[PDB]
Amino acid sequence: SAGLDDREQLASVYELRMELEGGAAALAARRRNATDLAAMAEALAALEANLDHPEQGVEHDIAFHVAIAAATHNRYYQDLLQYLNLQLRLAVSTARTNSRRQEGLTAVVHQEHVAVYDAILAGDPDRARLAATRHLQQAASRLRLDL
Amino acid sequence: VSAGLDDREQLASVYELRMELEGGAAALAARRRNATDLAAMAEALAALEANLDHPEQGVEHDIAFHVAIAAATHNRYYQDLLQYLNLQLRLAVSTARTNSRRQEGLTAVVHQEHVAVYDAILAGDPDRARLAATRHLQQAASRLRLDL
Numbered sequence A: 001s002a003g004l005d006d007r008e009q010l011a012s013v014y015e016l017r018m019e020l021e022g023g024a025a026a027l028a029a030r031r032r033n034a035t036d037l038a039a040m041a042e043a044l045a046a047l048e049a050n051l052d053h054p055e056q057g058v059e060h061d062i063a064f065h066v067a068i069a070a071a072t073h074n075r076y077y078q079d080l081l082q083y084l085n086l087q088l089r090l091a092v093s094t095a096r097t098n099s100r101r102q103e104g105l106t107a108v109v110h111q112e113h114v115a116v117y118d119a120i121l122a123g124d125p126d127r128a129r130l131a132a133t134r135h136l137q138q139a140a141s142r143l144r145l146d147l
Numbered sequence B: 001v002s003a004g005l006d007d008r009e010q011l012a013s014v015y016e017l018r019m020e021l022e023g024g025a026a027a028l029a030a031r032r033r034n035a036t037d038l039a040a041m042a043e044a045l046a047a048l049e050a051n052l053d054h055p056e057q058g059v060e061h062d063i064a065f066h067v068a069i070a071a072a073t074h075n076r077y078y079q080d081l082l083q084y085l086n087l088q089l090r091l092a093v094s095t096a097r098t099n100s101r102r103q104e105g106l107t108a109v110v111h112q113e114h115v116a117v118y119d120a121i122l123a124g125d126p127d128r129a130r131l132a133a134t135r136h137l138q139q140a141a142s143r144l145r146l147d148l
């Protein structure tokens, strides 16, 4: 429920997400179908509304990354992200609460999410992996985690 | 290889996920492993060297080696995830090792794949450790004709 002296624990979640979600983005770039695109795009639209009404932004952020995991068409990726759901909520909600005290930083975060969608849409697995890990490295650096 | 289409898809899915998880674990282990971690990995490799008598024991020492690499990340969540996947690991590893015993000398070749991961981690070389880990899983998937 907080994060002052919990940085090393946050760093452990983000560092694991970097290997899982980079791999999921690259798989999704190869296997996504029209139904997957709609799931990611609907999450991205709901995330555009939270730029002004920030309630449930954590659920929609998570739903976006879960939609990428579903787009791999690999049941074990999906089950791993559901198994780690509590850690995702901890990391996401900590990162978003921190982000909303600055700028349109929330809008810079929204762009990082869109960049992963865009590379998955193009079917470019290397670009998708790099965009997914950059989102996590930038979220960690915004939290001063030092991975 | 003889497998239903769904079995081949399931095996390909396990190896796909392992490549991302275990490639990352090996890179982290190359940074963080201590002398106890090295002992645990070498203990599994030594047990694997005495292979002939029973394959069922061979499967468990293979999984224990990969789990030891995950524990050597010193990341609470990596180790837990590999335990969570213990049934999928045993499925993949038992299918693979049974298949490799069909070709004379193949099991010794596979053993050098495990040594290469251990050696990279011992040397503290993350990029080398990641490559050896993913290459082991790529070759296993290809021995099984999974067409990843």
Ligand SMILES: O=C(O)CC[C@@H](O)C(=O)O
Pocket: A061, A091, A092, A095, A096, A097, A098, A099, A109, A136, A138, A139, A142
């Ligand atoms: O950096 C943020 O504010 C949000 C990061 C969040 O979207 C995440 O997936 O960790």
Ligand SMILES: O=C(O)CC[C@@H](O)C(=O)O
Pocket: B083, B084, B085, B086, B087, B088
């Ligand atoms: O070990 C568990 O807790 C559940 C195992 C799960 O990965 C499964 O194989 O269905």
Ligand SMILES: O=C(O)CC[C@@H](O)C(=O)O
Pocket: B062, B066, B092, B093, B096, B097, B098, B099, B100, B107, B110, B139, B140, B143
């Ligand atoms: O390919 C083999 O013969 C064994 C593969 C096994 O070591 C594994 O970790 O999946």
Ligand SMILES: [Cl-]
Pocket: B048, B062, B107, B110, B111, B114
């Ligand atoms: Cl072996």
Ligand SMILES: [Zn+2]
Pocket: A061, A065, A113, A135
């Ligand atoms: Zn996010």
Ligand SMILES: [Zn+2]
Pocket: B062, B066, B114, B136
């Ligand atoms: Zn192995």
